[PDB]
Design a protein around this ligand. Structure first.
Ligand code: CHL
Ligand code: CHL
Ligand code: CLA
Ligand code: CLA
Ligand code: CLA
Ligand code: CLA
Ligand code: CLA
Ligand code: CLA
Ligand code: CLA
Ligand SMILES: CC1=C[C@H](O)CC(C)(C)[C@H]1/C=C/C(C)=C/C=C/C(C)=C/C=C/C=C(C)/C=C/C=C(C)/C=C/C1=C(C)C[C@H](O)CC1(C)C
Ligand code: SF4
Lengths: 203, 160, 203, 41, 63, 80
């Protein structure tokens, strides 16, 4: 078992059964079993929103620097004008995510209850674990439903560790915009020129 | 009503608007026009001018002091002075009184009823704080069903 | 049966016999014994007054937009003059509402008591269930009798069309309060620019 | 969290968290809607 | 004597703190000559902090 | 001086005598409790009136009861 602090004893609540479990709990906030299942569910949607966040921050701004796309910076992207006002873009999204996350709220509380499509009862999700819904809408290639459990755990471990790098990255993009007032691709190319000086201590 | 002029046509109410901006304009004379403390007094003046234009547009009654007076009798012109925010208040105050009453019933039928009042059971509390929304239909419903009041034979009464 | 919230336990009072039962009593307004008999009668007048309300608010305003009635708006219909005084028509209504609702009040209190005529007692109402006064005056086509599974479907169709009308009439009320435009024109201003005619833009 | 949330559910902490939210709400009502003497609705 | 051990009684004694209050009987003394044999335990303490008090069977009814 | 009265609600728990600082109360035999003893106040003229016995009585309401009446040099607690 790989662990974050190789001399330390791993915690009792982190038994290695969860994907991406490396025993990192110094404050011990996942000690309660009922709160640990909520926090794993909190970490899953945090990971996937940050990877979707990192593909809208670092991917199109790299294409903006390379001249592939003329999209604005991620900090000033909400300030731009669209066909729908940004105040009423939220309540369209809030209504659309009251069905997306509110039906996800029932799956965390009651597993195996919102897996059936209400409009057409023949359609259902091929998922058995909380946080991994499956089905055609979410797993159209069927890679997440495998018979073997060792490959399935490593692929979920691959999902978590790709997630938590982006949660460092989107948080990294927030503080870089607050400190340097510059896009993080432009902070990378400034750091790729002279990495000795172009850092956080360049002021 | 009650010898009070409306505040939109009150000369004393317009005098208090004139002498409040003039107090704040003289405070602005010792600052730079683009300075940070001058933006606070400029926001104070626009807060004052918003206030006086809001009081005159609501049909407020101003006396001889130039001050807006509230008519709490239940006048059809004056509902938002006492009757409308009173019904808004009593709904909120009855919400506080109904979710505190329903919490005590929910913890009286418990193993240790006194440890649930120093340590308030938030999943038990938050599931009835939502239920305090519809409380006039639940207070008079408990009043009509007899569950709101306790009979005097089961109430601790000090002797005569 | 389907419920208002998947993964949520149905309340013990709403057991699924009542037409239109989706286990929707989150605030417990019909818990008490003997209370759900009053709240169905309350739902039935409110749903039928709203379907009477929606046929007098939207249908004459829709035909005013076509222009084959030229009826005034419903929120300005109290200012319209008639052959009677507008204040007088209130009290003549509540003398007729004193008769019609107190005959309905005794049916909820003592069922099977006021189905007979007060004047010519050979005329008796054929309704058996509380809240369904079958007779020649109210159901002349005899659609309120049959099998219990067939009767439950048409009683489900009253309240599902009735709950929509309640939401409708409550919508027209708030629309006429903050926008001061009649609700068929509010529909036609929403099919032109839907993302600019929203409750946030109307505040 | 079997005992940390029990401490967080105590009477002084829940009074601080509620009145922190309550005075936090009533201050933010008094920013966007200040000088409110008459309810217009 | 007494109503029952382990039963719910209501105190009719005027000067007690637990007048018209639900109490649980824990002991009834069957020795003759005892004026207040029924020992009733209460969920709430009085101002002295105790919950144990002795009452006669004439000052209690079953509720 | 002070009149200390014992009532029949006493359980013979003896703590009214143990709380007495002027030796007023004593435990006499009795037939009305499990302990088969009741308090009494023979030296009630020595009573200061402090009601330490009423503070230590677990019976609701109190079995020992001190009524503050005529006060003399015993019940005033003076040394001069
Ligand atoms: C706020 C988002 C967030 C949440 C809810 C979690 C939640 C979790 N992480 Mg985690 N992480 C999060 C961001 C990040 N993590 C990590 C790196 C790790 C490692 C190496 C490990 C975890 C583990 C865990 C689990 C430990 C239980 C616990 O005490 O949770 C309490 C945590 C919170 C309530 C969030 C923090 C609150 C905030 C700082 C205030 C839990 C599911 C362990 C595990 O076993 O996973 C399966 C583990 O070994 N995380 C990084 C990289 C620095 C993150 C991004 O910055
Ligand atoms: C129960 C349904 C009902 C609703 C929602 C309304 C609503 C309204 N009526 Mg109204 N009325 C209703 C039933 C009746 N009204 C009237 C007789 C009047 C008159 C005379 C007037 C109103 C007016 C009004 C409007 C302003 C009053 C107000 O501020 O309300 C809170 C408001 C749209 C006033 C109006 O139209 O001004 C714009 C007005 O002058 N109503 C009668 C007796 C025939 C009714 C029967 O029950
Ligand atoms: C995915 C993680 C990640 C990555 C690769 C970067 C990369 C960069 N950051 Mg950094 N940063 C991060 C997250 C990240 N950061 C976080 C979480 C914060 C909040 C504290 C910031 C806040 C921050 C500021 C305010 C600034 C930078 C700047 C920079 C650049 C110079 C290096 C430096 O001074 O680092 C500073 C690093 C930190 C303050 C935090 C350490 C970063 C993480 C937490 C540790 C490493 C994690 C992981 C092992 C990285 C894997 C890298 C791998 C892909 C090769 C560099 C391109 C500077 C810049 O613009 O350069 C011109 C700048 O001024 N960063
Ligand atoms: C759990 C909610 C609850 C309920 C429903 C009521 C309701 C009642 N109380 Mg109150 N009260 C409560 C909490 C509650 N109280 C608490 C927490 C205290 C200590 C401050 C008191 C102290 C108290 C006094 C001093 C008086 C009442 C009285 C009253 C009556 C009229 C309301 C009143 O005087 O204003 C409310 C009075 C207050 C002092 C405000 C306290 C209300 C707090 C803020 C609610 C806290 C609830 C929350 C869950 C914790 C009514 C029977 C009066 C009476 O004898 O009946 C006619 C009276 O004289 N109460
Ligand atoms: C005054 C309106 C009214 C009344 C009498 C009821 C009565 C009933 N409803 Mg309800 N219903 C209504 C409105 C109403 N409904 C509307 C408009 C909706 C659509 C949003 C529904 C949707 C609905 C569902 C899906 C179901 C119920 C059911 C219930 C039953 C139990 C709960 C109860 O007693 O609620 C009592 C409610 C009130 C007394 C209204 C209080 C309103 C408060 C004071 C303010 C609310 C503000 C509002 C949101 C604006 C009872 C027969 C269940 C049932 O078995 O039905 C047969 C069921 O599952 N209702
Ligand atoms: C409870 C339901 C309700 C209420 C409050 C009313 C009340 C009103 N409607 Mg309306 N309406 C309703 C349902 C409702 N309607 C329905 C069910 C329809 C049929 C689809 C209509 C069709 C309708 C038309 C065609 C007109 C009204 C008009 C009227 C007004 C006078 C009615 C009249 O001429 O006396 C009728 C008296 C009888 C004895 C019958 C009044 C504002 C009139 C109006 O706005 O004034 C010009 C108008 O011309 N309504
Ligand atoms: C969407 C409309 C709707 C629906 C589905 C029904 C359905 C029902 N009603 Mg109801 N009701 C409604 C509107 C509705 N009602 C309104 C608006 C009122 C007030 C005027 C009434 C007043 C009412 C009473 C008081 C009684 C019923 C009864 C009936 C039952 C048999 C009649 C029937 O099949 O109606 C079919 C409905 C339609 C085809 C809608 C016609 C729409 C036109 C075209 C406009 C059935 C459960 C009767 C019953 O159950 O007695 C045993 C009974 O006497 N209803
Ligand atoms: C039968 C249900 C129903 C239908 C189909 C409509 C349809 C419409 N309404 Mg709405 N309305 C409803 C009920 C309904 N309403 C209710 C219950 C309320 C009272 C709280 C409102 C209050 C309301 C306001 C204040 C506004 C609308 C407006 C609108 C339009 C845009 C939607 C919007 O921004 O507001 C949606 C608002 C809601 C509260 C959603 C409630 C809908 C669910 C189904 C109930 C749309 C044509 C706007 C308009 O004038 O269009 C130009 C507008 O200004 N409505
Ligand atoms: C029960 C007594 C009582 C009543 C009826 C009010 C009610 C009011 N005060 Mg308040 N006030 C009171 C006690 C009272 N006050 C006390 C005890 C203090 C001192 C802490 C103040 C100091 C105070 C501040 C500083 C403000 C209010 C404001 C208000 C308004 C609140 C509007 C809103 O949305 O929030 C309302 C008119 C605000 C307002 O709009 O002023 C009119 C505002 O400026 N009041
Ligand atoms: C676990 C543990 C253990 C024990 O408990 C102790 C402690 C220490 C406490 C711990 C730890 C912790 C931590 C580290 C935390 C952190 C986290 C994070 C950072 C997150 C993020 C997270 C993040 C996230 C989700 C993110 C998201 C994002 C997004 C949406 C974005 C978006 C966008 C885009 C696309 C672009 C455009 O143009 C703009 C926008 C719109 C802006
Ligand atoms: S303290 Fe009270 S109960 Fe105990 S012996 Fe003295 S008088 Fe009796």
């Amino acid at each position: 078992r790989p662990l974050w602090f190789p001399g330390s004893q791993p915690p009792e609540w982190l038994d290695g059964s969860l994907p991406g479990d490396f025993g990192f709990d110094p404050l011990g906030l996942g000690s309660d079993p009922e709160l640990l299942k909520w926090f794993v569910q909190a970490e899953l949607v945090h990971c996937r929103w940050a990877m979707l966040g990192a593909a809208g921050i670092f991917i199109p701004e790299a294409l903006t620097k390379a001249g592939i796309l003329n999209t604005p910076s991620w900090t000033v992207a909400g300030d731009q004008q669209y066909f729908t006002d940004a105040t009423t873009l939220f309540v369209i999204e809030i209504i659309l995510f009251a069905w997306a996350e509110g039906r996800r709220w029932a799956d965390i509380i009651n597993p195996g209850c919102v897996n059936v499509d209400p409009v057409f009862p023949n359609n259902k999700l091929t998922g058995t674990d909380v946080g991994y819904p499956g089905g055609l809408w979410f797993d159209p290639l069927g890679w997440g439903q495998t018979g073997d459990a060792a490959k399935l755990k490593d692929l979920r471990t691959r999902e978590i560790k790709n997630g938590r790098l982006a949660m460092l990255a989107v948080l990294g993009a927030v503080v870089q915009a607050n400190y340097t007032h510059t896009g993080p691709i432009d902070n990378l190319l400034a750091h790729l020129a002279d990495p000795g000086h172009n850092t956080i201590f360049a002021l | 009503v009650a010898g009070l002029t409306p505040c939109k046509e009150s000369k004393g109410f317009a005098k208090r608007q004139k002498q409040e901006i003039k107090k704040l304009e003289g405070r602005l004379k010792l600052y730079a026009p683009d300075s940070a403390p001058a933006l606070a007094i400029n926001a104070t003046i626009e807060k004052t001018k918003r206030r006086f234009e809001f009081y005159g547009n609501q049909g407020l009654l101003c006396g001889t002091d130039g001050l807006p007076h509230l008519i709490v009798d239940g006048d059809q012109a004056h509902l938002g002075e006492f009757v409308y925010p009173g019904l808004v208040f009593l709904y909120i105050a009855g919400w506080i009184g109904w979710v505190g009453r329903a919490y005590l019933i929910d913890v009286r039928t418990s193993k240790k009823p006194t440890e649930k009042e120093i340590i308030i059971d938030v999943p038990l509390a938050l599931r009835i704080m939502s239920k305090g929304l519809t409380w006039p239909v639940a207070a008079i419903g408990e009043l009509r069903s007899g569950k709101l009041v306790e009979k005097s034979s089961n109430i601790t009464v000090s002797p005569r | 049966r389907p419920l208002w919230l998947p993964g949520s336990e149905a309340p013990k009072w709403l057991d699924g016999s009542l037409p239109g039962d989706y286990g929707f009593d989150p605030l417990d307004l019909a818990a008490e014994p003997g209370r759900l008999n009053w709240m169905v009668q309350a739902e039935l007048v409110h749903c039928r007054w709203a379907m009477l309300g929606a046929a007098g608010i939207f249908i004459p305003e829709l035909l005013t937009k076509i222009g084959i009635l030229n009826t005034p708006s419903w929120y300005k219909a109290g200012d319209a003059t008639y052959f009677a005084d507008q204040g007088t028509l209130f009290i003549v209504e509540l003398l007729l509402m004193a008769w019609a609702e107190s005959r309905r009040w005794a049916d909820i209190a003592r069922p099977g008591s006021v189905n007979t005529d007060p004047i010519f007692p050979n005329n008796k109402l054929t309704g058996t269930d509380v809240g369904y006064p079958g007779g020649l005056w109210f159901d002349p086509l005899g659609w309120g009798s049959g099998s219990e599974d067939k009767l439950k479907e048409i009683r489900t169709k009253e309240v599902k069309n009735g709950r929509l009308a309640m939401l409708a009439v409550l919508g027209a009320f708030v629309q006429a309060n903050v926008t001061h435009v009649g609700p068929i024109d509010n529909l036609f201003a929403h099919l032109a620019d839907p993302y600019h005619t929203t409750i946030l833009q109307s505040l | 969290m079997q005992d940390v949330k029990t401490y967080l559910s105590t009477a002084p902490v829940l009074a601080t968290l509620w009145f922190g939210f309550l005075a936090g709400l009533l201050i933010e009502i008094n920013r966007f809607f200040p000088d409110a003497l008459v309810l217009p609705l | 004597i007494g109503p029952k051990r382990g039963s719910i009684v209501k105190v009719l004694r005027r000067e007690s703190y637990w007048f018209n209050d639900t109490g649980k009987v824990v002991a009834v003394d069957q020795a003759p000559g005892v004026r207040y044999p029924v020992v009733v335990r209460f969920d709430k303490v009085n101002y002295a902090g105790v919950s144990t008090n002795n009452y006669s069977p004439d000052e209690l009814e079953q509720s | 001086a002070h009149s200390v009265k014992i009532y029949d609600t006493c359980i013979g728990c003896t703590q009214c005598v143990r709380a007495c600082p002027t030796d007023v109360l004593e435990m006499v035999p009795w037939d009305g409790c499990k302990a088969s003893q009741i308090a009494s106040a023979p030296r009630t003229e020595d009573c200061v009136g402090c009601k330490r016995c009423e503070s230590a009585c677990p019976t609701d309401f109190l079995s020992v009861r001190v009524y503050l009446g005529a006060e003399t040099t015993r019940s005033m607690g003076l040394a001069y």
